[PDB]
Design a protein around this nucleic acid. Structure first.
Lengths: 46, 93, 221, 63
RNA sequence: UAAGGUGAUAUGAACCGUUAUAACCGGCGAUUUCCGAAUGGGGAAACCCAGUGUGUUUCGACACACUAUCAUUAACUGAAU
RNA sequence: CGAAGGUGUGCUGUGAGGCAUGCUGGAGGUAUCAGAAGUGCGAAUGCUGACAUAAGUAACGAUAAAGCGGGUGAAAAGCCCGCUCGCCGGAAGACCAAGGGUUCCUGUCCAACGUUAAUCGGGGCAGGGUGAGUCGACCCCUAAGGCGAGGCCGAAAGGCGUAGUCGAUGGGAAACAGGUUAAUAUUCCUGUACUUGGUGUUACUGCGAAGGGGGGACGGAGAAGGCUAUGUUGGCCGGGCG
RNA sequence: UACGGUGCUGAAGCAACAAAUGCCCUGCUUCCAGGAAAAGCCUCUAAGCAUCAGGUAACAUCAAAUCGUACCCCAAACCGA
């Protein structure tokens, strides 16, 4: 088949890139929980 | 304050090996790791103090196609230049 | 004589990588020269020898027939084709006859060019497929399967390297040999020149056998 | 440790920089780029040498 | 503090100390790139684009420092009135 | 100089259990009495790992047919080449975005991997490759739309929203034809061109506002028509008579 | 000529018919549904400054940065386990 979620990079970084998860304190929950997990996945970036 | 020796420190290596070394690394046209943004300037004027080439076409291209350097482990590609200039002379070697 | 193949050219395109990591050992196949001119020798042996015949042949023809190649007296040539082709050496330079030096010198150079070219047309050396000889493989761990070397796209590398090895320093060697005699030397300035070279290809032969009969030191393809 | 150099002034630190930072990768770090080093150790003091240039610039105030 | 050393896998290469001058430890210092609260803007940070100063300039161009917001305070000026 | 265990055999205890003992094994294990328990599994379609079956059973993925002769090599339905056959062809051609983004060339390698055979592949593994004032992106301008000092709302947290700031799927300088590597391309080269903007110089000269005016600047349909790439021919020019 | 490939050359090189869904053309026309914006772009003054500076024209000069460019791309390079 052909599935349900597809690329868009035309929003990616500004769906959760650095100033898009910093942007939110609650997406700095993400980053708070990744200053609490030391996960490689963060905003899924470098 | 008028130029910098900083980009007269641009030499990092001539390319080599198989095809494309032929006049691409020799004669006019030469290809070589040159800085990282080059400058298109003191990379044509640092060979104009060395061969007097005003450089037939100053070009740049960052160099691409896959990581290696343990390609059967994980690989890392730091990225670099092929100068890929055409020099206007190549005769004072 | 001995500062006449000291030089560094060197090519690595031969590939290996085995046990990667750069203080583990190394990672390549590691060919080089540093020494050159190596089948153009037999030519200048011939060129000097030809003059040995003429000085012999002419003197033989002189006191048992007709001067055709020169006039002698006092043992050696004094005149003729045989004089202008005689070698000045023995203990010191001859600066008395500059035209003799010029003709003899030109004569020897062109004689050396001649047997070098006949070392093209009968018995020489190859580059084109000496090129292609190596690449079937490089050196493998076993594991890395080369194509840094390219089986053709190498002919030229060879045809830049070889000659000067049948010609192209035949001229130069014949020159070097001639001026080696204008200085003069004991045992012959040219004979020293040939001797040093013969000795160098020799010396290493005396030494040569010992290391790789442990099965070879390796990893250079 | 403690026991090196002679200190260098910033009227001649000048001269040092034109020989192991510049026009040294045109002959030794060009010729690193052209290998043949059985004298690996020499190279390491092209670095660690002009790295002392700017130590004895900021530490010693150019002295 | 020291006779052995030259970070690891990484053996090599070359060297070093040449035993107190390697190396180590401890103090101090230096650099400490790029980003990043980041703060000249932009901005999908590790990047785009920039200014202002202070310089240089060969006049082609080129270095160098400064330039955030928001709070608190002071000082100067000062509408509708 | 043989602990534990793994592991045979004989004796024993009701059993829980115990003994004797061989091998292997190559290290440790351990009275009594006394102390303390994570102290014993056949069923939970239990958990978890290892290990079965069917069964060599099913299966080996789209019919757009290939066939042949050489080659390589140990070996070929598939590798290599060639020669003969079929099929798509407003696609099954040829070129792109996105995305991949190296999958690419080149050179190699065959183990694994490709749905088999494979020397072969985008496999595996080495190298090599994408070059621009004029082409594009960075870049200038605007949409939806966002943000938003200050501002106006709201326990905190926090909202609405200005001056502004951001923001394509829309609008802002110019180059082409040849010719070129197995990797290049308006990018390289060649030939012949193009452009804009800064500088400078010169000559003349009133210049002068986030201002003002002007202007960008526009639908759909429909009715035509014109036109040319061009297409087709003839002619032409060359070659050829099966 | 390796046998991989390289060197050497060049005739015709038009016209008719017949052309395009290509274009003149944002044209024209028509119809109501009602058809961006800004920049680019032009011009005027304004305060000012005032010939100056600027401007305008010609000419000349210089500059024209930072990156992409391989290749699949209906496909073994996208997606589909």
């Amino acid at each position: 088949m052909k599935r349900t979620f597809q690329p868009s990079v035309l929003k990616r970084n500004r769906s959760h890139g650095f100033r898009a998860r910093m942007a939110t304190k609650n997406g700095r929950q993400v980053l708070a929980r990744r200053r609490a997990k030391g996960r490689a996945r963060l905003t899924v970036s470098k | 304050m008028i130029r910098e020796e900083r980009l007269l420190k641009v030499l990092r290596a001539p390319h080599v090996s198989e095809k494309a070394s032929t006049a691409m690394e020799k004669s006019n046209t030469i290809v070589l790791k040159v800085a990282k943004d080059a400058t298109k300037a003191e990379i044509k004027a640092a060979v104009q103090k060395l061969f007097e080439v005003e450089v037939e076409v100053v070009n740049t291209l960052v160099v691409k196609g896959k990581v290696k350097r343990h390609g059967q482990r994980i690989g890392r590609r730091s990225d670099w230049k092929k100068a890929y200039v055409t020099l206007k002379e190549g005769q004072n070697l | 004589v001995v500062y006449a193949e000291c030089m560094r050219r060197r090519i690595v395109v031969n590939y290996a990588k085995r046990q990667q990591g750069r203080r583990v050992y190394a990672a390549q196949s590691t060919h080089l020269p540093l020494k050159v001119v190596y089948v153009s020798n037999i030519p200048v042996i011939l060129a000097a020898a030809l003059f040995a015949n003429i000085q012999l042949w002419g003197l033989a023809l002189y006191r048992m027939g007709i001067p055709i190649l020169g006039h002698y007296e006092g043992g050696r040539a004094v005149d003729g084709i045989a004089y202008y082709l005689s070698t000045p050496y023995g203990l010191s330079s001859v600066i008395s006859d500059p035209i003799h030096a010029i003709v003899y010198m030109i004569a020897m150079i062109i004689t050396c060019v001649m047997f070098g070219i006949f070392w093209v047309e009968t018995t020489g050396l190859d580059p084109k497929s000496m090129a292609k000889r190596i690449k079937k493989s490089g050196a493998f761990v076993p594991g890395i399967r080369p194509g840094e070397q390219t089986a053709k796209y190498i002919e030229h590398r060879l045809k830049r390297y070889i000659p000067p090895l049948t010609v192209m320093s035949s001229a130069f060697v014949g020159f070097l040999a001639t001026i080696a005699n204008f200085i003069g030397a004991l045992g012959g300035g040219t004979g020293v020149l040939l001797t040093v070279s013969i000795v160098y290809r020799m010396y290493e032969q005396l030494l040569r056998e010992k290391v790789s009969e442990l099965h070879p030191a390796i990893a250079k393809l | 440790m403690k026991a090196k150099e002679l200190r260098e002034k910033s009227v001649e630190e000048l001269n040092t920089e034109l020989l192991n930072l510049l026009r040294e990768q045109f002959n030794l770090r060009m010729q690193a780029a052209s290998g043949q080093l059985q004298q690996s150790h020499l190279l390491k003091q092209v670095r660690r040498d002009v790295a002392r240039v700017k130590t004895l610039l900021n530490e010693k105030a150019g002295a």
